[PDB]
Amino acid sequence: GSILDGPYQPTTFKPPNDYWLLISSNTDGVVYESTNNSDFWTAVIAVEPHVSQTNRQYVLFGENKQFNVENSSDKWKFFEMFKGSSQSDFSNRRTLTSNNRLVGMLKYGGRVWTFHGETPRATTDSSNTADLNNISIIIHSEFYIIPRSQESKCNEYINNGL
């Protein structure tokens, strides 16, 4: 009784406004890398359950980066790593803890919205940008597309599973 647009194969593109990208995650590492090359960089890093503090390397926007990471929980963690200018540092802005292993990204009202917190009570949160139009995302896994008018379904998928 339900129809979902997708899956789409891993790709690089500029997502339209008003659509959720529901991005699957199939492994530890970089889930996606999104930037407009002016005031918005977000890369999501997946860390598998039960990882004690450890150093790992990730390729973010063409550069090798080292992060000390930890996941004490029995759920996957998806760390949003953000920087707000080209020469700013990355910081962990927000995190989704979820064994549903799905993350969401919406361009809407001059902002980027994502889900954070711990499922099944994950909620949406925003980052402001002056250049939404040029945000381009590299997605390293299969994803689906859900119109914002169907956000309630994206919420259910993120929180309760696909």
Numbering used by the authors: 62 to 223
What does the literature reporting this entry say, word for word?
RV is a non-enveloped double-stranded RNA (dsRNA) virus with three concentric capsid layers encapsidating eleven dsRNA segments. The outermost layer contains the glycoprotein VP7 and the protease-sensitive spike protein VP4, which define the classification of RVs into G and P genotypes, respectively. RVs use the VP8* domain of the spike protein VP4 to recognize specific host glycans in a genotype-dependent manner. Our studies show that VP8* of these genotypes engages the type I precursor glycan (Galβ1,3-GlcNAc) at a unique and conserved binding site that is present in all P, P and P HRVs, and the subtle sequence and structural changes lead to an altered glycan configuration at the reducing end in the neonate-specific P RV, that may play a key role in the age-restricted tropism of some P strains.
However, although the VP8* structures of P HRV (DS-1-like) and P HRV (Wa-like) in isolation have been determined, it is not known how they bind to cellular glycans due to the lack of their structures in complex with any glycans. To investigate how other prevalent HRV strains recognize type I glycans, we determined the crystal structure of VP8* of a G2P HRV alone and in complex with H-type I pentasaccharide at 1.6 and 1.3 Å, respectively.
